Amino acid sequence: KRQQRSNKPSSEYTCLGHLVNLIPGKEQKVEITNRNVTTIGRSRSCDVILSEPDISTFHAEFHLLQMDVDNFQRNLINVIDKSRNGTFINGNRLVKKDYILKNGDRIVFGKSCSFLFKYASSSSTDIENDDEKVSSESRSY
């Protein structure tokens, strides 16, 4: 007789954003799904498992939301710190319990662990055949 029924585990929801770990000896890329809630720490159950010997299990939580308006999809990220070890976002200490994170945002967990967040959308393109024309305020040089 078997000893397994139904589905308990749950992962690989839907691609949306990623986390890049800035290290002077390497780099680490993490995948962020539309789980509404993301866990960061040492707990394997958490969303993102850092490589720190003293990384808080509940270190921090990230809210991944995806909504469609007009035609495209607008995603927003929220940072929540339980307050215990030490989490720094945007190079500054967090005080509020409802920080809004967007594309191109540097995040630091603990003190040394530093990573940048950016939306993955689906599949980026190269800058070899992608010219940037001035009209919708894209650049200024």
């Binding site: 040492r42 159950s45 010997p53 003293d54 070890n85 030490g86």
Partner: peptide, 10 residues
């Protein structure tokens, strides 16, 4: 998967 809880830092 059993991981060590939170700890103190320097």
């Amino acid at each position: 998967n059993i991981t060590q809880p939170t700890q103190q830092s320097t």
